[PDB]
Amino acid sequence: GSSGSSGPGPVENLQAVSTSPTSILITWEPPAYANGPVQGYRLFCTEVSTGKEQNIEVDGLSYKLEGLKKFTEYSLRFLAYNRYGPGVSTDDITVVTLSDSGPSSG
Questions:
Q1: What whole-number distance in Å separates Cα of residue 58 and Cα of residue 60?
Q2: Could you give phi then psi for residue 13, rounded to 5 degrees?
Q3: d(Cα 69, Cα 22) in Å, to the nearest integer?
Q4: Domains of the chain
């Protein structure tokens, strides 16, 4: 069929951190040692708690995730994919969402 793909390299300046109870600011960049261009970037959000992974298709070099669990160890996975396909994937990004709790006076 279509035997012509090697897979691009792992993006650079990749980092994900939550700034709120349920969020995830993923900031990545275009790789240098990559095979050809980069059609885009694919993200995979997995809920260690349950174990469900949801594939997402974002664009650019910055995406703020929302609709997560207050405080739950989440594991994401970022990688680059071009005409050929998805290349080397990064290490499971573990980022425990913040915790909305402090001033509790009853």
A1: 7
A2: 35, 45
A3: 6
A4: 13-98 (2.60.40.10)
